[PDB]
Amino acid sequence: GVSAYLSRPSPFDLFIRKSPTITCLVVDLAPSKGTVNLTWSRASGKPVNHSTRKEEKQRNGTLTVTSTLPVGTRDWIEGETYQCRVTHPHLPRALMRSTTKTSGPRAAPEVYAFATPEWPGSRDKRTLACLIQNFMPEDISVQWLHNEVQLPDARHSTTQPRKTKGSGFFVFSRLEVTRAEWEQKDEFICRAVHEAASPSQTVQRAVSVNP
Amino acid sequence: GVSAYLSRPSPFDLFIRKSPTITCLVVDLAPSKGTVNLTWSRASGKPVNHSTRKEEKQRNGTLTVTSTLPVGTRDWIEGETYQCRVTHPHLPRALMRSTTKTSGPRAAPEVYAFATPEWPGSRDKRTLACLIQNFMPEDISVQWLHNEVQLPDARHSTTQPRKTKGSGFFVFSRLEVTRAEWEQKDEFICRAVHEAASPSQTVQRAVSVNP
Amino acid sequence: EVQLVQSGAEVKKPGATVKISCKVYGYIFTDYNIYWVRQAPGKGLEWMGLIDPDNGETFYAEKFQGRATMTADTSSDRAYMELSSLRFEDTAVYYCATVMGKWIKGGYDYWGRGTLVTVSSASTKGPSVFPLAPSSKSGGTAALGCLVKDYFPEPVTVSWNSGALTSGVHTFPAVLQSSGLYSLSSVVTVPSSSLGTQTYICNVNHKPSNTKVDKKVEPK
Amino acid sequence: EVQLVQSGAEVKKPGATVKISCKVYGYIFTDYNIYWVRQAPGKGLEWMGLIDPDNGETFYAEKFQGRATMTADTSSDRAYMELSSLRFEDTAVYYCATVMGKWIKGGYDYWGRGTLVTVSSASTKGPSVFPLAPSSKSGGTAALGCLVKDYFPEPVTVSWNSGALTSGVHTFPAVLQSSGLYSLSSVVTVPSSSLGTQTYICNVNHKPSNTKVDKKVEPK
Amino acid sequence: SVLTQPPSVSGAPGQRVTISCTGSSSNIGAGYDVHWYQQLPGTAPKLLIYDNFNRPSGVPDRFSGSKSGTSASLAITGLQAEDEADYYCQSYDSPTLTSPFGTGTKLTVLGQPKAAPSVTLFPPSSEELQANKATLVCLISDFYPGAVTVAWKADSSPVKAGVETTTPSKQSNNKYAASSYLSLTPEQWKSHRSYSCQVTHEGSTVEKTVAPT
Amino acid sequence: SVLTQPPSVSGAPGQRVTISCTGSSSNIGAGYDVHWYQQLPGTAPKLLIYDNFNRPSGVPDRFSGSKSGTSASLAITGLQAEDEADYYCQSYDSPTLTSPFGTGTKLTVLGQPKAAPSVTLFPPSSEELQANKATLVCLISDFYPGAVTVAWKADSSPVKAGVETTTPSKQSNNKYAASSYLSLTPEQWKSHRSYSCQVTHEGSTVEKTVAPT
Ligand SMILES: *[C@@H]1O[C@H](CO)[C@@H](O[C@@H]2O[C@H](CO)[C@@H](O[C@@H]3O[C@H](CO[C@H]4O[C@H](CO)[C@@H](O)[C@H](O[C@H]5O[C@H](CO)[C@@H](O)[C@H](O)[C@@H]5O)[C@@H]4O)[C@@H](O)[C@H](O[C@@H]4O[C@H](CO)[C@@H](O)[C@H](O)[C@@H]4O)[C@@H]3O)[C@H](O)[C@H]2NC(C)=O)[C@H](O)[C@H]1NC(C)=O
Ligand SMILES: *[C@@H]1O[C@H](CO)[C@@H](O[C@@H]2O[C@H](CO)[C@@H](O[C@@H]3O[C@H](CO[C@H]4O[C@H](CO)[C@@H](O)[C@H](O[C@H]5O[C@H](CO)[C@@H](O)[C@H](O)[C@@H]5O)[C@@H]4O)[C@@H](O)[C@H](O[C@@H]4O[C@H](CO)[C@@H](O)[C@H](O)[C@@H]4O)[C@@H]3O)[C@H](O)[C@H]2NC(C)=O)[C@H](O)[C@H]1NC(C)=O
């Protein structure tokens, strides 16, 4: 019948953009009924901002309600729990989805950056790889930059956080780069955004194609 | 009611161990009925080997049939399709799950191996990272070796295949290693097993902690 | 996000077989039928057939009976179409499509990008690149080009001064000669005043033949 | 494979709060109730309460009312237990457990590994390591050790000659002194004949205090 | 059974145009749903209408569908440049158990300013002449209505031997481009003291001309 | 309500032993299911029986459960060394809406050869003496029945001041280990011309002894 999902603010949104938001999605396979309410609240009792709202009846007959709530970074850091409560249809119990900052010890990531040896054929392209590890909570964002301008997201792929043997998480990120970029200027930064990185929630490493 | 899954032979099993097997799993949430048949066949008509079989009624009331079929590597390479057919309960249509070698062009992986700079605290540990890329079909196995003996699986983690921009796949693998290992002998191999690697379906790169 | 990802373009000799793939993300592959639709160049959509991934059963419009075979690899979320006894006329874009319904007739909601299948007697051949010199200097501007001649299969890439020169560039669609080979031209329009000082190189890349050509284009 | 992964051990001062976590893999977190069970050292299992992840509702046995708070972070597949006004007697291993049922009373099928929570007035303190010299040489073998003295919280690791020496080693469980600090001994049994030629170093690692001590152990 | 649609249909922005889809009593006439798809050049079809009159998530309300007896009809109000596309209907056909697409209709949006074409004509280069081959390359661009006629003349006499002309194709600026290539032997090219490319478009003709050495 | 079990129960390999679980008419007596759990030292409980008599996937059939009126009973046939564990029952208790665990029973497997303990006794080291502290370390190992009594004597007079003895714990070889530590001032340790560690086990006593400089 009804499924509901709520996302986490990305670290990039908490600490860089600094306008973080969370998104509550409801998927109702049989909208046989009237309105499906969906309501935000905070565990503390404090008020929430207004949220966007959007409904689509989908071609297969499913109804799809999305809602987006802006949250405070400071509130998020102090422990707020944000809650999306789904209400009405043939639901005895309401559904409720929630998100809060992860428990446990904190620990800034270590970043390492590596370049690929020239491969026959490629010549005009090179591969950069960034290993980011030992960070605690696994929440993390990753940017690559060049001429102190952040590259587009889709230029790189980053893997999902997995647990290291022992404690903390790691993550790999990969960016192909072109001769026109590296001769332009032979420096690329791999930057992680993480709540425990401290002055300002980031750690970065520079890497170069040649020596 | 009834779900069914069938796995793919790992490349490590096709090309190294050389006794590859596939596993057909049925999960039936309401075993209200009698026997659930599960039957192997090949798309070509040719006979199959005998398979292991195992049933467990689970505590939550689910019934769980697993079956394991040995297959030929040469048969697999020539295009066989293996099929697990699930039969009986309140199923009008039978279910059928299948597995076959992936379509399209082939291309051996490129392996690159990197070591981590000393990190304060660690000292007695170092991190190795292997980038494996541009391979086609995404099916791949990864071993790390030391003193020409393959390390245990759980010593390393490897990521899921993702598509590079353009063509082919990549994969990262990570292995922590200890001072006792690298002073013992400072060479570790990262080995990929892949159908297109040709003499013998493998490509490897050596890496060292110091220079 | 639901996605039907189709495989790259295929180029075949008449009589061959090709197996193109349609890989599914975002729902349970085995829940819903997948449909295949053909579209010859410049022509209309034609509904070929459907497969049911949960059990492998298929159904084909008369016209494709025998020469299309629809399969499904459940272990890898992949619906395959296999075309055989290929004929020139089998040249078309082949699409897979779906609707997350079950028990519903048409109106496909989700579509792959299409896989082109080209059938020809021709063999792979790299291009010749001839410089198309600026008709010697003058009032404003001047056109120079590269003639990319006699190559098979198509896609060719042409770039100028290694991507650095972008303005004024116009690369025309190929002609298909009766030899079955393709030819095309890439033309750049440049200030006539820069002719004796700025270098003009065209970079031709013909991936199918694994040929890269770089050619300077000098005033006559 | 279904797995309930619990967080590491926690060490608290009386009056504190701790939040330990139980992360779920292998089914839809929000489908089934999670139960929490306490077990004081050497004592029996006690059923604390249950939460329903789909909607956040909870229920507690009388004894834990007020001082245990069960929550669930659906966005991250995580059931949390929060213990407050901590007391010495609250020292126990806390387990989360489940059954993929719904509408079923007991018989938990899947269990986390346990999170130990230790409550004490003591403060973190690294060990002193004193060498426990071989009672001077002789007939066969001889015992030497390291006395790991006066440290808080527990776990201490002891290894010999950096892991190279493994045979004959016996590290005893700690004593808890009334000062609230712990002491322990690690003893190795060695051929008495090797005493003047083979080096014996003990490596003590006390992670909670971030202290590593290496000490040689020489015959008296 | 075929579901038949008119091959083409015409616009003028902001206006309302209809496309029809006619089957028989064994498909549309039989109570089976009609659906509609829109295809832009070089892209996969997109579903516009489903079950007769329903719009999927994201389709402007200016598109509407109706189903009469044996026919169904798509209606676009407030015609826009971007609506210029191919449209296909579909329904179910129980004598074949299929769900065929209609013959398809090419929507043309009127207005669009006429344009005469630019022409560039390159002689063979000396490198090709050494390869013992010769090609005159006539590049035609920037014209609207996308129909041309290329004729090559050799001196003043027409050729019609070994001329190859591409079909016209939309460039990114919504005008059309085409190329015409003429193969000669070096001795031919050296024989005549000139050759010419004559492009005829919308009754007017642009010729350009080149000569040997 | 409490579900009560006997604190302990005894074995002898290959034999059959039972554990009982007694509630009242508001839980077990009320028709509510009983379940059983097995706990090995330092590990999480595992479910053995559920719904009275059912075994979950992988539990040997030698374990069985029955439910009488107000009681339920676990039975293990063919007792094995590895069955030595804690066992708990559980049922539902509607006056509290809870599903409590029983008080628990410690299964003991008989047979198991008696062993007297090894003793090692280290004097304070000179480093500690300089730290103005002194500890005699008495390490006791390899004994079965896991009960000891440590008494320290100073010369020949007992001490009983500042002695700390661990509880005994199973070593990997299924025998037990314990340590007793005795704190003295350096002047004390230097005063007496000897101290002694006396371990009493199963009515026999092993003493070991050390002296200053
Ligand atoms: C009728 O048709 C409709 C119309 O399409 C079908 O709608 C879809 O319904 C499904 C199933 O209920 C639903 O899937 C769920 O999507 C949620 C939300 O996605 C967010 O969360 C992610 C953050 O963690 C993030 O990935 C995601 O963005 C992206 O998701 C994909 C997948 O990787 C990305 O590649 C892409 O960027 C996309 O935007 C959103 O932020 C997702 O979280 C759900 O959770 C998952 O569940 C599966 C279980 O198999 C697991 O694989 C995962 O581990 C995870 O737990 C789940 O995928 C779609 O969102 C619905 N789509 C729309 C448009 O409404 C409908 O089902 C169908 N009806 C029938 C009967 O078939
Ligand atoms: C009553 O309780 C029973 C008793 O436990 C529940 O049984 C489980 O039922 C589920 C759901 O039907 C079923 O999950 C499925 O598992 C299959 C098979 O796993 C194989 O395939 C994988 C190879 O690709 C491989 O991962 C796997 O080995 C391992 O899986 C995990 C997960 O990563 C590993 O970490 C670990 O090594 C484990 O051994 C096997 O080779 C799996 O393929 C299924 O597919 C997945 O579906 C989800 C959709 O959300 C996606 O996330 C994935 O992308 C993928 O498509 C799926 O996970 C279990 O196998 C059953 N367990 C047993 C013991 O029978 C039962 O559901 C429950 N009943 C009720 C009503 O709740």
Tab-separated table of N, CA, C and O in Angstrom, chain F residues 153-194:
chain	number	residue	atom	x	y	z
F	153	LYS	N	50.293	-15.307	53.659
F	153	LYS	CA	50.937	-15.283	54.960
F	153	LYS	C	52.216	-14.481	54.828
F	153	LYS	O	52.861	-14.463	53.768
F	154	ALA	N	52.530	-13.772	55.906
F	154	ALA	CA	53.706	-12.929	55.994
F	154	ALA	C	54.627	-13.542	57.052
F	154	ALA	O	54.448	-13.347	58.257
F	155	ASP	N	55.599	-14.308	56.580
F	155	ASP	CA	56.464	-15.061	57.455
F	155	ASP	C	55.777	-16.385	57.802
F	155	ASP	O	56.232	-17.461	57.387
F	156	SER	N	54.699	-16.289	58.584
F	156	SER	CA	53.902	-17.440	59.061
F	156	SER	C	52.580	-16.933	59.640
F	156	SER	O	51.626	-17.694	59.791
F	157	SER	N	52.534	-15.629	59.915
F	157	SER	CA	51.320	-14.903	60.306
F	157	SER	C	50.442	-14.553	59.074
F	157	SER	O	50.977	-14.088	58.066
F	158	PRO	N	49.101	-14.773	59.134
F	158	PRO	CA	48.256	-14.348	57.984
F	158	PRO	C	48.252	-12.828	57.799
F	158	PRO	O	48.694	-12.119	58.711
F	159	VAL	N	47.781	-12.348	56.635
F	159	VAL	CA	47.724	-10.903	56.318
F	159	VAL	C	46.324	-10.318	56.368
F	159	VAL	O	46.034	-9.513	57.261
F	160	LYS	N	45.477	-10.701	55.408
F	160	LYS	CA	44.119	-10.145	55.257
F	160	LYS	C	44.003	-8.587	55.191
F	160	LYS	O	42.945	-8.008	55.518
F	161	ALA	N	45.072	-7.907	54.776
F	161	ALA	CA	44.992	-6.468	54.582
F	161	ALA	C	45.515	-6.159	53.207
F	161	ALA	O	46.655	-6.501	52.866
F	162	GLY	N	44.657	-5.527	52.418
F	162	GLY	CA	44.993	-5.152	51.060
F	162	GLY	C	45.387	-6.314	50.167
F	162	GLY	O	46.443	-6.293	49.569
F	163	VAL	N	44.526	-7.323	50.092
F	163	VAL	CA	44.690	-8.457	49.203
F	163	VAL	C	43.554	-8.354	48.245
F	163	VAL	O	42.461	-8.092	48.668
F	164	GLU	N	43.803	-8.538	46.957
F	164	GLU	CA	42.725	-8.550	45.985
F	164	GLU	C	42.802	-9.783	45.092
F	164	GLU	O	43.822	-10.049	44.444
F	165	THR	N	41.707	-10.533	45.065
F	165	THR	CA	41.653	-11.754	44.301
F	165	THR	C	40.555	-11.702	43.238
F	165	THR	O	39.384	-11.340	43.500
F	166	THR	N	40.932	-12.084	42.024
F	166	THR	CA	39.953	-12.114	40.963
F	166	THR	C	39.084	-13.305	41.209
F	166	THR	O	39.444	-14.233	41.905
F	167	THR	N	37.898	-13.213	40.653
F	167	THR	CA	37.066	-14.325	40.353
F	167	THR	C	37.782	-15.272	39.393
F	167	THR	O	38.640	-14.840	38.630
F	168	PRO	N	37.447	-16.568	39.431
F	168	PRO	CA	38.034	-17.521	38.507
F	168	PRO	C	37.361	-17.448	37.139
F	168	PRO	O	36.184	-17.222	37.055
F	169	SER	N	38.099	-17.638	36.069
F	169	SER	CA	37.489	-17.600	34.762
F	169	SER	C	38.045	-18.724	33.867
F	169	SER	O	39.239	-19.015	33.932
F	170	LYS	N	37.195	-19.316	33.024
F	170	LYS	CA	37.618	-20.383	32.131
F	170	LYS	C	38.682	-19.937	31.140
F	170	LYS	O	38.474	-18.994	30.392
F	171	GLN	N	39.823	-20.620	31.127
F	171	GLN	CA	40.820	-20.392	30.098
F	171	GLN	C	40.383	-21.231	28.904
F	171	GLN	O	39.488	-22.078	29.028
F	172	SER	N	41.025	-21.028	27.759
F	172	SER	CA	40.685	-21.777	26.543
F	172	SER	C	40.789	-23.334	26.655
F	172	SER	O	40.186	-24.067	25.862
F	173	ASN	N	41.528	-23.835	27.638
F	173	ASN	CA	41.631	-25.271	27.805
F	173	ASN	C	40.609	-25.826	28.777
F	173	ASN	O	40.846	-26.859	29.398
F	174	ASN	N	39.491	-25.130	28.931
F	174	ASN	CA	38.448	-25.509	29.902
F	174	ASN	C	38.830	-25.697	31.393
F	174	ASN	O	37.987	-26.114	32.193
F	175	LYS	N	40.067	-25.377	31.770
F	175	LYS	CA	40.389	-25.212	33.175
F	175	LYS	C	40.262	-23.738	33.575
F	175	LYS	O	39.980	-22.861	32.742
F	176	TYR	N	40.470	-23.448	34.849
F	176	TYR	CA	40.282	-22.084	35.326
F	176	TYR	C	41.569	-21.376	35.696
F	176	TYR	O	42.573	-22.012	36.031
F	177	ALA	N	41.498	-20.048	35.648
F	177	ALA	CA	42.576	-19.172	36.051
F	177	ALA	C	42.075	-18.096	37.011
F	177	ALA	O	40.901	-17.681	36.958
F	178	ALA	N	42.978	-17.642	37.880
F	178	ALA	CA	42.738	-16.494	38.772
F	178	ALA	C	44.077	-15.881	39.219
F	178	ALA	O	45.122	-16.522	39.101
F	179	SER	N	44.032	-14.646	39.721
F	179	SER	CA	45.210	-13.935	40.187
F	179	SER	C	44.892	-13.343	41.547
F	179	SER	O	43.766	-12.885	41.793
F	180	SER	N	45.883	-13.313	42.425
F	180	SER	CA	45.732	-12.592	43.680
F	180	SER	C	46.908	-11.651	43.845
F	180	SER	O	48.063	-12.064	43.678
F	181	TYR	N	46.606	-10.387	44.142
F	181	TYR	CA	47.608	-9.340	44.208
F	181	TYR	C	47.666	-8.842	45.631
F	181	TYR	O	46.618	-8.613	46.239
F	182	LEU	N	48.858	-8.662	46.192
F	182	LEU	CA	48.930	-8.167	47.576
F	182	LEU	C	49.755	-6.910	47.657
F	182	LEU	O	50.938	-6.950	47.323
F	183	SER	N	49.149	-5.806	48.098
F	183	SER	CA	49.829	-4.504	48.167
F	183	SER	C	50.465	-4.306	49.514
F	183	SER	O	49.809	-4.492	50.535
F	184	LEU	N	51.756	-3.974	49.515
F	184	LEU	CA	52.474	-3.594	50.738
F	184	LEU	C	53.290	-2.349	50.509
F	184	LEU	O	53.622	-2.012	49.366
F	185	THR	N	53.635	-1.681	51.601
F	185	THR	CA	54.651	-0.634	51.547
F	185	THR	C	56.011	-1.344	51.382
F	185	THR	O	56.198	-2.462	51.910
F	186	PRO	N	56.962	-0.715	50.655
F	186	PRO	CA	58.339	-1.214	50.615
F	186	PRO	C	58.895	-1.568	52.008
F	186	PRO	O	59.477	-2.641	52.182
F	187	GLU	N	58.707	-0.700	52.997
F	187	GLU	CA	59.185	-0.996	54.338
F	187	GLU	C	58.563	-2.288	54.893
F	187	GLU	O	59.230	-3.025	55.609
F	188	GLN	N	57.308	-2.584	54.547
F	188	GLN	CA	56.714	-3.845	54.981
F	188	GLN	C	57.444	-4.998	54.318
F	188	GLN	O	57.964	-5.889	54.988
F	189	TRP	N	57.487	-4.955	52.990
F	189	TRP	CA	58.124	-5.976	52.195
F	189	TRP	C	59.566	-6.217	52.629
F	189	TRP	O	59.995	-7.364	52.722
F	190	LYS	N	60.300	-5.144	52.919
F	190	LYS	CA	61.673	-5.258	53.453
F	190	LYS	C	61.748	-5.736	54.908
F	190	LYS	O	62.798	-6.210	55.345
F	191	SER	N	60.650	-5.597	55.650
F	191	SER	CA	60.648	-5.919	57.071
F	191	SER	C	60.718	-7.426	57.250
F	191	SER	O	61.748	-7.954	57.675
F	192	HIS	N	59.625	-8.108	56.906
F	192	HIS	CA	59.554	-9.562	56.932
F	192	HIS	C	60.628	-10.134	56.019
F	192	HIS	O	61.009	-9.497	55.032
F	193	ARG	N	61.142	-11.307	56.362
F	193	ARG	CA	62.163	-11.923	55.536
F	193	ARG	C	61.527	-12.915	54.574
F	193	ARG	O	62.243	-13.713	53.971
F	194	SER	N	60.190	-12.859	54.434
F	194	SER	CA	59.436	-13.656	53.445
F	194	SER	C	57.902	-13.521	53.505
F	194	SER	O	57.328	-13.368	54.583
